Each structure stands twice: as C-alpha cells, then as structure tokens.
Design a protein around this nucleic acid. Structure first.
Ligand SMILES: Nc1ncnc2c1ncn2[C@@H]1O[C@H](COP(=O)(O)OP(=O)(O)OP(=O)(O)O)[C@@H](O)[C@H]1O
Ligand SMILES: Nc1ncnc2c1ncn2[C@@H]1O[C@H](COP(=O)(O)OP(=O)(O)OP(=O)(O)O)[C@@H](O)[C@H]1O
Ligand SMILES: Nc1ncnc2c1ncn2[C@@H]1O[C@H](COP(=O)(O)OP(=O)(O)OP(=O)(O)O)[C@@H](O)[C@H]1O
Ligand SMILES: Nc1ncnc2c1ncn2[C@@H]1O[C@H](COP(=O)(O)OP(=O)(O)OP(=O)(O)O)[C@@H](O)[C@H]1O
Ligand SMILES: Nc1ncnc2c1ncn2[C@@H]1O[C@H](COP(=O)(O)OP(=O)(O)OP(=O)(O)O)[C@@H](O)[C@H]1O
Lengths: 362, 362, 362, 362, 362
DNA sequence: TTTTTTTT
C-alpha cells in the first residue's frame, strides 16, 4: 500500500513548515506508536502531539519509502507557493491581521492552562517598555500604520542614540511583531547581492547599526555601511520594482519592503536623510539599568525584546476599533482577561516601581 | 484517470501567469468545490473566480499527482515561448497596442461595478501630473513615439535634477505604462551580467539615480555607475543583437531595449553625454508639495505613480486619431465616459486648487 | 530479494554518522563474515564490532546493489534531519545534558577494561588546571551557566594576558566540553563570509588570537581582527537572527552562538568592550612551567587540552545537585568511582607537587 | 501514433533556429488547422507560412506530448552542431561570403518596407565619402582582399591625420561594414595584457589612437601607446600563433587577426612605420565640412559613419565579377534597384553639391 | 548477460585507482583477446598484465554497456570510501606500516627478474646518502618516530645551510618515504589561504625555502616567509585543531600535520626557534660534488632523490625489532637478499670511495 | 550550471 503525498502536504501546510529537513525530521517521529509517544504524553510540542495520531498510519509507510526527500520537496513547494499567492493578492492589512491571529494563538498557549509563562512577568515587561519612550503606544500605532500604508519615499524610521540606548531592543520587538528580517550592510559590495536576496517576499527589513565614516573623531570605528546604503536609494524609495538574488535561482522582481534603521551617531548625507520620514532619539537612563539589575528575569526570558510584549501593550492601551474588524472579538476577549488579571492600580504600582528604579515587583 | 497538462497550460496562457510557483499555488486552489468557493462567491480575484468552475475537475486530479512542479514547468514555458515568438514577430506598434488593450481591460474593471477607484480622485492625479510640467501629455506622446521608433543612438532620454523633483515619479508612471524594467548599476562591473539578463524581451528600460563622481562637492558621494555606463555604451547604442544571459539557461541574442535615465546632478562624461536624444530638467515646486500635504490620498493610492493615470491623461488630452488605429473604438468609448463624467469647470477647479496648493477636491 | 534501506538508516542513526563516504565505507566492511571478522575478533573498534553481526546479511545484498550512493544519501539525510529538529526543539540546558551524556560514554570506555587510559594521569591534569586560576571550578560553573542562559549582549568572555599563559589551552578544554568550533577573524574581509559560515547550528564559538593594531609598541604583530570584530557587533549581541552562508548554499538565518575571545594585550574599542561580560586576566607563572617540564605525559597525551579533563574536575568539585536531573544517576556512580580510587591526601599531594614545581606524580 | 522527432529537427535546420524557446514557441503555433490559418492567409511570416501545412499533423501530436522541451533541446543541438562543424572548415572567403550575405539580408530591411531612411540619403553619404579621398570603392575592395588573404606582415594599414580628419568616422564605417572590434593601447602596460586578449577570435580589429609618447611636443596628447605598440611586434606580423588572455579564464593561443590602426600625427619610429603595409592620410577640407554643415541629416542618421553605406558603395561601383561567384546573384539586384532609383545624373548632382559644398540633396 | 559491477569494483580496489577516467580507460583495454595481448606479452605495466586474463570476460560485456561511466563512479566511490574509513580509524604507526608495504612491493618489481633497476646502483645510492650527514641512519630513525608520535610542540624540524647543500634533496626523499606535500609560504597573505588547503589529510608537510628578511645583509633575497610563519604558532605546535580550505570546497578541521622547514642562513626570531625539536646543519662538501661528477647515474636515474633509497638504508642498518611487527618478515627476507648480494666489505669500500670523492664504483 | 574563484 502506497504513501499518501496528500497527507504529507497537508501536514506541511497545517504546520507552515517550509524547510525540507524540518519537514522530513518532524514527519518521521510519527512512525512510532502514538499511543506510547512520550512527546505526546509530555505534551511537549504542539506541532507534534496534535498531529501524531492522525499521521501515524501514513508515517509508517513513509518510513519505508525510497523517495523520501522528493515527497518532502513537493510538500515544501506547496507551502512556498501559498506564500507567493498570498503576497500577490492580500492587502497589507490582511497580512498584518493574519500575523496578529498567529501571535494571539501563541498567547493562548503561553498563558493557557499549560500556563508555561506567567502573565505578571509578561505584563511587567510592558510597563518597562512604556517607560522607554514618551507616549510609547502612540509611537507603536503610528509605525504600524506607516508599514501598512507603505507610502512611497515615506517608508523608513531612523533610530539614533548612544550605545546601549535601547534602539536595537525596540527594533527587535517590532521585527517579531510584524515579521521580517535583519540584514547586515557593513559588508563587501559583491556578497551583499545575496544578502539582499534574503528580503524576498517579506514584510519588513531592519538594517542594524550600520557603520558610517569619520566618527572615529568620537571613536566610532568607521566602515562602509553608509556608503553601501547610499548605493540603494531606489530600494528605500519603493517607487519601482527591483530584482533580487538567490543562489542557483533566477531574479525575483518586486517592491523592496519598508523598515527601520539603527544608528550610533555617525553623520548622514542628505540623499539618505531625505528618505527617512522620522528620526527617533534614544537615551541611557541609569534607573532603567537599576530596574533591570533587579528584574533580570526580563532579560533571561527575553521579555522586553519580544513582539508579544508590544502586542500586549497595544491591547492594554488602544480602543478595540483601532484593530482590524475581524480580530476585534479576540481583542475584546483578551482585554477582558487583562482587565480581570490586573487592576489599573497594580499597573500603576509597576510603573512607579520602574520610575523608582527598584525592581518592578514589590 | 490522468491529469490533462493541456488544460493546465490553457489556464497559464489565459492568465498569462509566467511563474511556476505562482501558477502552482493558484491552480491548487481550484481543487475544492467551486460551488461553495468563498472566493468565487465573494468575487475576490478574477484570476480565480472566472476559472474555478471550469478547471475544478482537472484540479482535483492534479491535487493527487506526484509530478506537480514538472507539469507547471511545461505550462510556464509555453507562456514564455509565446512572449518570445510574439516579441520577434510583432511590430513595436502592435506590441504597444497590446499593452494598451491590457491596461484598458484593467480600467474597465477598476471603474466598473466594483468601481473601487474614484475616477475623480484618479483625474485629480492627472491634473497633478499635467500640472507638473507644461504640455505634459505632449512630451509623453513624444516619448512614446521615440520608443516605438527605437532609433539607434537616438534611443535614450535623460532626467536630471535634485532630490524630490519628481523624476522618479514620472519614470514610474511611464514604466507602468510601457511595460519595461528598472535596473540598478551602482554595482561592481563584473557582476552586472545577470542584472542585464532581466532586459531579455522587454519593450523599455529605466536606470534609477545612477552614481556618478565629483558630486561630493555637493554631498553626492561618488560611485561606479557612471563608469559602468561608459563601458556599457555598446548596449546604449543598441546597434547589434547582444547575447543576454540567465542562470541555468542558454543565453539569448537580441537588440538591447531603449530606455530612460534619472540623475541627481553628478558629472557626465562626454562619451555618455554624447548618447542621448534629449535631456529634461526637474525642479522642486513647493505649491505642489502643499497640495499633496492635504490631498495625500493621491499618494496613498500611488495614483501619481501609476501608468493608468497617464492613459487617462492621453485619453483626455489627445485626438482619437492620434492613437493607433485598432484601439480607437475603445478610445472613443472611454472618451465618452470621461466626457460624460466631467465638466471642464470641475477639471479646471481642481487644476486651480492644484496650482494654489489647496486640497484639490475643494 | 532486496536491500533493507531501513537497516541502513538504523545504522546511520545508531552511529550518528553524517558523512556519506564514512557511512558507505563502514557499511561495506560488514559484507565479510562477522564470524571470521578479525576486527570483531580483535574487538578493535566499537562502531564496527557492535554491529557487524546484526547488519551482515543486508550488507551482503548491499554489496551487490547498483544504487549504493543513493541509499547512503537518504540515510545521511535522516541523521542530518534529526539534528535540525533538535536545534529547534531542545532547551539549551537539555542540549548540554546530551553533550555530557556522550562524553560520559567515552569516559566509560576510556577507563574501562579496554583500559586505554590511566585515571591517575587524567586526575593529575585536574590538579594542574585547578592550580591555573583562583576558584577554577567556580569559573567553569559560571561559564557553563552563561552559555545555557544566553542572555542578550551579556554573552561573551574576553581572555587576555601574555603569550604562553594557557589561554588557548583553557579555551580548547571548554570548547571540547561543549559543542563548538573555533574561528580565525584576522582574515581579509571578503573571505570572512565563508569563515563565519562554520558557526551554523553549533553551540559555542571561540575566536582565536584576535590581532589588534597599535600593539607594535608592545612588540605585538598587528592585524585587523579587532576591527573586523567591531563590524560583527550584532553577532556578539545575539539579540536578533543573523544570516549565515556556506559555499553553494542559500543563507541560513539564526541566532549567532555565544563564546570566548582570546587575545594578547592590544586595546579594544568601547563598542566591543561593552559587549563582554567578563574579562579573565591570565598570568605566566614559573612553578606551572617547571612542574609541567617534569610532567610532560600531560601534554604528550593532550590531557590538559581536553574536555574530559574539565568534566572530571566538575565531578570532583561540584555538588550532585548542580547537574541536570537525569544525569545525576550517572554522576553519582562516577563520584563513587573517583573516591574509591583517590583519597584527598593523594589529590592534595598532587596539588602540592604542582605548587612546589615538582613533577606532579610521586 | 507519436511525435516524429525527425520532423522537428528538420524545421530547426531549415529555419536555422537555434533557441529552444523560439523553436518551441513557433512549432506550437502549427497545432491549429493550417487550412484556416490566418497567418498563412495573410502571408505574415515565411518562417510560418512556408511550413505549417507540412508540419501540422506532427504539431497536433506534439501539442499533447509531455516531453516537449526535450524534443526541442535535441533539435537545437543539431543546429548548433552544424555551426560547430562548419566553423572548422571556413576559408576566410567563405567566412566573408556569409558576413556580407548576412548584411544583404539586413539590407532587405534597410530599403525594404521598413525603409527607415532614404536610399537617397544613403547614397548621399556614399557621395560625401567617395570624395574624401581617391577612388574609394577600389580602396575598399583592396582592403577587403587584404583581409581575406591575411598574408603575414602584409596585414595592417594606418590612418594618419590630425584632429577632425575623419579617421574615427571612417573607422566607424569600416568596423561597421566588416565586423571586428576596437581596442585601446594607452593603458599602463600593467593593465594591457587582458585588453589584448579582447581581440581573441575577432576577424578584424581597429586600434584606437595611440597617444604619442612625447606626442604633446606636437600639441597632441602624450601617452604610452607608441612604445606599447612597437613592443608588440609579433602580434602585428601574424608570423606565429600567440597567447591570449581572457579575464577570469585561462590562456588561449591563435594567429593574431589582421586589421587597422588610427593615429593622430605623432612621431612614428622607423621600426613602427616599417610594420605597415599602407598609410592612408587624412586632413580637414572645406567643401567636406561645409557640405556636412548643410547635409546634417546624414550625420543625424549617422549614415556617414555607416559601414552599410560602404556596402552600398561597393554594390554600386564594382564589377560583378569582383564578388564571390554565387553571392554575385544578389548584387545585380541591388544595382538594378539603385539604377532604377538613380541615374548617374542624380549621383552626379549629389556629388556636385558635395564638391560645391552645397547640401547634397539640393 | 549482465555486467558484474562487483568485478569492476574489485579491480578498482585492487589497483587503488580513484580517478574515474583512469579507471575507465584501463578497464576497456581488457576487452581485446588476452590470449594475444601485446601489452601482456611485453610485460609493460603490472596494473595491466596481472589482471587482463581475469577481467577479460566482464570487460567484453562492459564494452557493450550503455551505463559505462555510471559503473565507474560507484567503483571510484568505493576506493574513496576506503580512504576515509582508514583516515579516521588507523593509528599513525599503522599508516606508516601500510606506506612501507607499498614501497616494498615496488622494490620487488624494480629488482625482480623483470627488474629494470640495478640493485648495485641503488646500493651506491645508499652509500652517497649515508655520507651526507653524521649519524644518518640514526637520524632517520629519530625523524620517523617524531612523526609517528606527533607529540605537540615537539613536532617540527629545521634544515639550514648554503645553497646546493642537499637540504631539499633530503626533504624530497623523506616526503616520498612518508608521503605528504610541499608548501610555499613566501606570499602575500591573501593567497596563503588556499595554499594551506594542500595540507588537508596529508601525513607530512614541507615548508620549502622560507625567505627571511634582512638576509640581504649577506646577499640573501629578502621576503615575507618567516614573517608569515610566525603568525601560525598554533599550526606548528599542533596542540589544537585548525580550519582548512580548498577551492570549491567547504572547510575541514583537523590537527595540522608535522613536517620540515628549510632555509638558507636567514636570521630566526626566538619565537620561531622555540618551535623546533631539532635543527640540522648542511654543509657543501666538495668530495660529494666530485663524486656526483663521476657517478652521474645517481642523478640521472634520480636515485638519491628517492624514498626507496632511504628505505634501503633503513633495511640495511636498522635492527629487525625496530620495524612494525607485521612487516618484520618481509624485512628479514630483504635483509637476507641484501646480505646475500653484498658483503659488508664491498659496501664499506663504496663508502671509502665516496670519502675519496672518486667515483663510487670499481 | 552555478558557484566559487578571480580579481582588487
Ligand atoms: N534607555 C536605556 N537606559 C539604560 N539602559 C538601557 C537603555 N536601553 C537599553 N538599555 C540597556 O542596554 C542594553 C542594550 O540595548 P540596545 O541593544 O537596545 O541598545 P542600542 O542603543 O541599540 O545599542 P547598540 O548600538 O550597541 O546595539 C539593554 O539590554 C539594556 O541592558
Ligand atoms: N516637482 C516637485 N515639487 C515638489 N515636490 C515634489 C516634486 N516632485 C516630487 N515631489 C515630492 O518628492 C517625492 C519624491 O519624488 P521623486 O522620487 O520622483 O523625486 P526625485 O527627484 O526623483 O528624487 P530622488 O533623486 O531623491 O529619488 C514625491 O513623492 C513628492 O512628495
Ligand atoms: N600560566 C602559565 N604560566 C607559564 N607557562 C604556562 C602557563 N599556561 C601555559 N603555560 C605554558 O604555555 C604553553 C602554551 O600554552 P597555550 O598555547 O595555551 O598558551 P597561550 O598563551 O594561551 O597561547 P596563544 O596566545 O598563542 O593562544 C603550555 O603548553 C605551557 O607549557
Ligand atoms: N575630411 C574632413 N574634412 C573636414 N572636416 C572633417 C573631415 N573629416 C572629419 N571632419 C570633421 O572632424 C570631426 C570629427 O571627425 P572624426 O572623429 O571622424 O575625426 P578624427 O580625425 O578621427 O578625429 P580625432 O583624432 O579627434 O578623434 C567631424 O565631426 C567633422 O566635423
Ligand atoms: N653536501 C653536499 N656537498 C656538495 N654538493 C652537494 C651537497 N648536497 C647537494 N649537493 C649538490 O647540490 C645539488 C642540489 O642539491 P639540493 O637541491 O638538495 O640543494 P639545496 O641547497 O637543498 O637547494 P634549495 O635550497 O635551493 O632547494 C645536488 O644535485 C648536488 O649536485
């Protein structure tokens, strides 16, 4: 009796798996008796224990197959095709709406009955971020609109401030929220070709702390980052489709996605300054160090640098109407949970703790 | 029973889909019962909702196949082969009349019963564009003619001027009209070969804001595109059918397309200066800026970037007889629709507001 | 009758082999009779003698196969797929627990009846290592925790001091204790792309002997490793997923691992100094040298380089509670075995000899 | 029944089609009933209507094939192999035969229905050139035979003349007529090796003018090209095969092609002078330049830079017997055309205007 | 009837061939009638004449196969697989023992009844080599043990002395005896990367003729050799692994081999001096020069270059117990042959003749 | 074949 390639394809689709080796490895686990499957019994990974019983019979036949890599390749191609279809047909707002549903599904696990992390430590992170900048949640909402609208040559925000000002942290949290990638531009112009190939078919890019020049006056070690970017004015502008690499693969032509750039304070030529729409300034604050020095669980669990914390911040602060119409129900549900789990006075206490630079909890 | 590769290819031809993943993805959507297909019901995408009912049976059998990518390969190659054969056997006029028919087909939908575009917003775009330079439509006709005639060493026009002067904006609309390609050559000489590969079988090309030299006198940092163009002068002359390249494929002898260049004001070498039909200056004009600042929905919807605005402009400004012959029926049909929609007062009231710097729709 | 590919995949899994040639070459040995197999009878090599008699009949049929490399390719893929799955799903603690289990398995062999090693020689090395720094075992525990926790920015330790202060000796031991590989970044900037590719999916990294510049005053030969490092600033921070490259392969995206930097007494930019948690300051000492001269069986058997030596140190000094819970069973048996062999007086006698600069043994 | 691979290959040979996508594209068109075929009915392309009826039955079966691209690949190989075989049998006269037979077919466009500049203007260019210097038609036939005979040392002619002597304009027409390539030699020797390799396997070359070593003694730019050339002794002579050097590729070796040199009027060494077969000698003349200033459409059409004007000139002046035996059959036809087009008195009146300095077409 | 792939693989294993083309061509020769085979009858190559009779039948079927290169690939894979198994599993003593067996086999041919060599001339070779240094046979035995033990730090030997004082002669014979490859470090650092790639999987390396700097004080050409070496202190001391790279290959990681460094009288930094176990002085001795001048068959047959001569020297001088236990039987057999064919007095006479600087033989 | 190497 033969393998159902259809069952494999369905698993890959349902998992959103898009690496042939992950798919291969994952599917093989299901060859063993699901009844005794310790991973199921431990409820260890949902992408396993939800599926093992259903896929078990087909995995036993797959384990004998001579074709295995070919079956997995087709399944991965089906997932990749779905992404391309979506990218060409969804509005950007639907893309974000889908991305939000996925994060909310994780939150249903994180704070589920399994309760693998506690909502107090997570909510504590929100207060720390809210203190990081003035009017923080307003700044986040502006950024989301900007990325969704994707207005030509109004597409990039510049983060500037000293070392350890917090700019990388905020970028990292935003990048998780929207989904996207970081790219290193402090590199030679040749291999840079394939670096940009990474950006194919994605929502955001982040360029990290690109080195400028002449800042060694202030001991900013100089480098090609700024020179490199100014070759790519068109990529930022987003007025024209551009052609993107991959190894052993032909060009893809598409608009280069919007994003943000982080900078210790080298100088900027005005060709490039003209292309940022908004610069934000970041500053060291010792009481914030002191808070972290006590509340080190924030860093160990990477709470403050994670997009989940930004979503929780938005849920706490924004009217339900500001969310895309479909998810508004799930937002109401989480607003209710949060209002139930915390008084405002508790949140005010946490903010005061952060302000005092004591550990967030007392 | 067995997949009809014939029916697959027929859909590929009819959508003009020419990507193997895009084709693969979309055809798989047809495997479900079209009678409940929410996309059909909701009339979301014509590339789906027209074809689903027809292709359904074959798509179910396709969904079972083990050959899927290979089927899509042969289908795509038929689409590309049509393009190549058509590329040789048609006159540039016939090419352009095909392109215009395609855009007219979109417009028939965009202002159709779905009608999601306001004609008057779109016409406000036309006003802004014809306001950008005198006799805008007339210079557009001169450009179109020059590209149809495609005369050796009279095949390129230069746009030169400072940032935010609109040169990029105009190139976008022309390129969206003509169906060409952008290329970037601010790059290491040896690497450009596959970038030039994109020029295979294109009506037109555009080079964006190429890096020159000596402009750092004025904060324009130097780069190689200037020298690259000098070496590429062979293609710019377009005397002979150069053998263009693409990965894992045979190379392709053809005449290099004509095109446009945009420039912030670096030096020009005499040899490059020698090669143009024409130069055009571009000049920041604050009253337009003040208008857009109110009227920003124009730019949000990219109206002023989009060739559909130019086509509406030429329908408005130009004689029916100025168009190529066979389309002149559709020209009249659309001329009538504009004539039905507008008083000249409405247009003039708008163009007044544009000249002032008011919200165009006051 | 036909090859069982399943038996080959089992052998690959059981040996954890991931070279197609090594797998092939070993599997082919099983085709002769195990009953006369002199390697079995000499019981020379465990990856052979455990398995020959099981695999025998399938090896004989495999010897006749026309497909041999395809069979091995599928088997090696399964072992590679297993690693990929684990690299997503295991905790860093659980990885380290696995790594320990395998070293402990080699320790069971080395000190077995096969008796390739003298535990007294190996314990001598622990005395030399524990003498090299204050509170040596505490330093190892703090480092291991740091690598398990992987706290952003707080990820890297800097080793510096004169040449011949044992810094690379110590780095080697840690690197063998964990998983990982070394890297040399004094390179030209372009080849660096493939240098960093080595880090993919690994646990530790060690940057080896980074040349600074300006050290020529201290007679240090000079180079660009430090300036290269300050370009890789985000790789140290580990705050966001970077892109990594191998020859003929698409870029992987992942967090760059934590690790150690070794150098002589150059200076370091603030941007890079800010990225080290801890700076260990090694010193030349004569008694270590004069002891080691009279103790050269240490170097001749590579004892003080090797991870097995550090593991013996931890088993001696650290409480059973400090190990991950599942290995505490094996740890207790090894603790018993050690004390059954060595009195404290014997160990202190060894440390006394080292402190005296006498040959460790007496 | 089944696709005849035989018939597909016949068409590829008969059309000399040597691109797999074109072959695929065109052959697919035959699948419709030729009896109705509108392309046949309108005689639009011979490459179609010559063949459709014969190939139709095979094309119907071809359209159902699942191997289609593979059939076309084998067919294209056959055509490429034919070129490969013949490339090793070409006499230089047989080579020349084709290289003009090609241009006669191109000229079936030049004054076909395309007719894109006046056959009058084209002969007016011929008029203007024929009175630059003596007997120009004979001079072409002589230079032509020189390049076909390729007699060692007896292979190179020199254009000596000041700035604006026309030698560059002439050189344009020469390479245009004949093929070959232009080259520089004023590089530093350090560079020049690769530049010399560029000539590899061209039938002919031009050298762009040496900037005289000490040439500015004449008020003409100084440079290195003199000593560079006379150091390149043997390349000129073609006595023996020489090594040649492509960038990024290994050596090749070949008899160095014959050709042409341009010079402004520098201090040619006796040795360097002795290399040449024939100086030709050029200076400003007033009827010429003032006629240009009155015939400027010829420069705008660059006809006076045109080798096609030279081919036209030979077609006019020279005996039929001077052309190779069979290709002669075409030249009479263009003469017949040109004679029906023009009396002598026309070409006379044109020539008179040039001699008078009058605008040639007056 | 079928081809036996097994018989081909046996021949490949038997001949140790690992080039597919060399394997292919040789097997095809067996298809002609062994019963008349001229190559057999001339006894030209053992690799042919030993096997033709055996493989004749299979080669006849092989000659008709359509799969020929596919068969050879699997065969060559088997030989490469054998090498990689051996590469990991053998001891360094086992490796050398195998190497010795190979030379002993070649000697059995060279001096056989078919033997084209002269055992007396090769014995004259041993006399000249034994004269080149003090204690020569004791010195060789010391060098070998050093390579077999591969003790870190204690790994490398330095040769120095004038030009034409024999150093590379000895290096070449040692390199032939052990196997290994020579390296050139007198480079800029960029190419040095692929240079070291040669060392992968070698038993020995020789650093030929390292240029110091400042030897120009005494007319030695200055260069970057020594300066490049002292970067690589880890590579010599061999305590820890290094990364190694070849063109088009992913990096490997291993202990860098032991080896020899050679120079004229350049100055040596003490940093480098401490790297070496031993330094051997060579001095030009005129009686050797006059002996070669009268004993030219030594040079012309390359006798004194050959590792076979050093092997003969070991066989003649060393006690049987010094060889690896397995080969001691062959050593006894060769010692018997040599003691039979040469008296001690005769060998001593040759040694006396070399001391006289007269020709070796009388 | 591309890529990597070459090239700078
Ligand atoms: N505003 C702040 N005040 C004090 N400490 C801060 C602040 N922001 C960040 N930190 C500390 O700095 C560390 C690094 O933050 P982050 O990487 O976001 O800064 P950055 O300015 O982007 O730095 P860099 O340019 O070096 O990447 C944080 O983990 C936290 O410990
Ligand atoms: N003539 C103009 N006057 C004022 N604003 C202008 C003008 N043209 C363009 N703009 C503004 O400049 C923005 C960018 O226009 P565009 O990219 O076409 O200019 P550009 O001259 O090509 O610039 P750059 O050289 O920086 O790419 C537009 O979105 C619009 O907001
Ligand atoms: N603290 C010490 N005092 C004196 N000698 C030492 C000390 N530590 C190591 N040694 C000696 O130094 C030798 C080399 O050690 P190692 O290679 O680790 O030195 P290193 O200074 O860390 O080297 P590098 O800087 O080149 O990596 C050891 O084999 C030992 O002989
Ligand atoms: N025979 C001629 N008589 C007068 N003017 C001439 C003649 N030939 C060319 N010209 C003038 O010379 C100008 C440049 O022509 P061309 O480049 O062909 O000359 P050249 O001698 O090769 O020049 P250069 O050495 O400067 O490159 C033409 O545009 C024309 O004005
Ligand atoms: N000890 C010696 N006394 C005299 N002549 C010698 C001696 N050794 C070598 N020769 C002569 O020197 C020639 C070259 O020897 P060899 O190539 O080994 O020299 P080298 O000094 O090691 O060279 P290099 O350093 O250039 O590689 C030999 O062929 C022989 O003629």
């Amino acid at each position: 009796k033969q393998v159902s390639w259809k069952l494999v394809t369905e698993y890959a689709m349902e998992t959103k798996c898009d690496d042939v080796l992950l798919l291969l490895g994952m599917y093989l686990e299901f060859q063993y008796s699901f009844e005794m499957c310790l991973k199921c019994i431990k409820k260890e990974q949902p992408s396993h224990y939800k599926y093992h019983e259903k896929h078990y019979a087909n995995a036993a036949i797959f384990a004998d197959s001579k074709n295995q890599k070919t079956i997995c390749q087709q399944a991965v191609d089906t997932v990749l095709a779905k992404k391309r279809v979506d990218s060409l047909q969804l509005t950007r707002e639907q893309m974000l709406t889908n991305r939000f549903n996925d994060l909310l599904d994780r939150m249903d696990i994180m704070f589920g009955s399994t309760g693998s992390a506690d909502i107090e430590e997570w909510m504590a992170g929100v207060a720390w971020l809210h203190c990081l900048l003035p009017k923080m949640d307003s700044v986040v909402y502006d950024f989301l609109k900007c990325m969704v609208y994707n207005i030509p040559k109004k597409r990039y925000w510049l983060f500037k401030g000293p070392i350890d000002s917090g700019k990388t942290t905020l970028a990292a949290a935003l990048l998780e929220l929207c989904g996207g990638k970081a790219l290193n531009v402090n590199l030679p112009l040749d291999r840079l070709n394939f670096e940009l190939g990474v950006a194919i078919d994605q929502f955001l890019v982040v360029f990290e702390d690109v080195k400028g020049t002449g800042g060694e006056s202030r001991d900013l070690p100089s480098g090609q980052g700024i020179n490199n970017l100014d070759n790519l004015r068109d990529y930022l502008d987003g007025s024209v489709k551009v052609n993107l690499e991959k190894k052993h693969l032909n060009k893809r032509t598409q608009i280069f996605p919007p994003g943000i750039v982080t900078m210790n304070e080298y100088s900027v030529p005005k060709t490039l300054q003209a292309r940022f729409v908004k610069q934000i300034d970041f500053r060291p604050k010792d009481y914030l160090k002191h808070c972290l020095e006590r509340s080190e669980f924030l860093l160990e669990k990477r709470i403050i640098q994670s997009g989940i914390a930004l979503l929780l911040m938005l849920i706490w602060y924004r009217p339900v109407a500001e969310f895309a119409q479909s998810i508004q129900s799930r937002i109401v549900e989480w607003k209710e949970r949060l209002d139930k789990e915390f008084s405002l006075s508790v949140y005010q206490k946490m903010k005061f703790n952060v302000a005092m630079g004591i550990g967030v909890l007392d």
